[model samples]
Target: KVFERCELARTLKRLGMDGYRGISLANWMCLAKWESGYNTRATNYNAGDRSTDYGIFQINSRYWCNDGKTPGAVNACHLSCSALLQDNIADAVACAKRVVRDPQGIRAWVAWRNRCQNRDVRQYVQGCGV
Candidate 1:
């Protein structure tokens, strides 16, 4: 399932992602756009690394989720990667909030590092007023 951009923004804002989670809505949206394009079922399985990125944030199973196939997975979110692939994002959001608390913060995400970091993403959240 793919979420409409505005609807996602509104939902994220209600969840305190507009800044309360320590990353701006724009940066979060930028990450979501590049990582999964708002598609809940999106998955990126890299055979070489044997890691899988799941859901809208593309959270890696290597560290965040446990799919029971990725070797030595940390399961930091205590969730199956498949749990992320759904229209309901409550689990994903809760896990992401935990991820941001780490030392790297939003930099934990490669998408944020490559595209959203130290960049102006105001346009992403424009008119949503979050």
Candidate 2:
């Protein structure tokens, strides 16, 4: 799959974050398999919800292409892995890195919002690397 491209690892390495860079890639691939079945054309399984969280990135039309100014600006021209093709793999890797880097630590803790405990995704990504 295109998602396995090593450029992703290279990008994160340049970003200077070694925290979850090793395994985050694999976990991200797993999530993609689970989410959209790697189908850039897959739509949500929900009924009556024909929104545009389409493509491998699952970027909704509401999110990135807010004003219809994206690339060709065609009604069907979306930011899918193929639409923003260069951005597809790039964004996926970035998202994985962000999920870990932003939170400061992979160890999850009690959420102050709901008083509920959280857990680390490292438990899953560990299979990919040390």
Which candidate wins on TM-score? Answer: 1
Question: What TM-score would each prediction reach against the true structure?
Answer: 0.86, 0.37
Task: State the lDDT at 49 in candidate 1.
Answer: 78
Top candidate when judged by lDDT against the true structure:
1
lDDT of 1 by residue, 1-130 (tens): 6876766677678777778556787888878888888777787787677568877888778888877788767888888887777677876777687788788888887778798877998788887754
Q: How well is each residue in 1-130 modelled by candidate 2, as lDDT tens digits?
A: 3443233334344544434534444333334444555543443322443334444435444333322333322332322323423333454334334334444432221121122123243333344333
Off by over 4 Å in 2: 1-23, 45-51, 67-130
Model 1: lDDT of residue 38: 72
> What's the number of clashes in each of the models?
0, 0
Residue 51 CA displacement from its true place in model 1, Å: 1.9
Q: Weakest 10 consecutive residues, lDDT, candidate 2?
A: 108-117
* lDDT score for residue 101 of model 2: 47
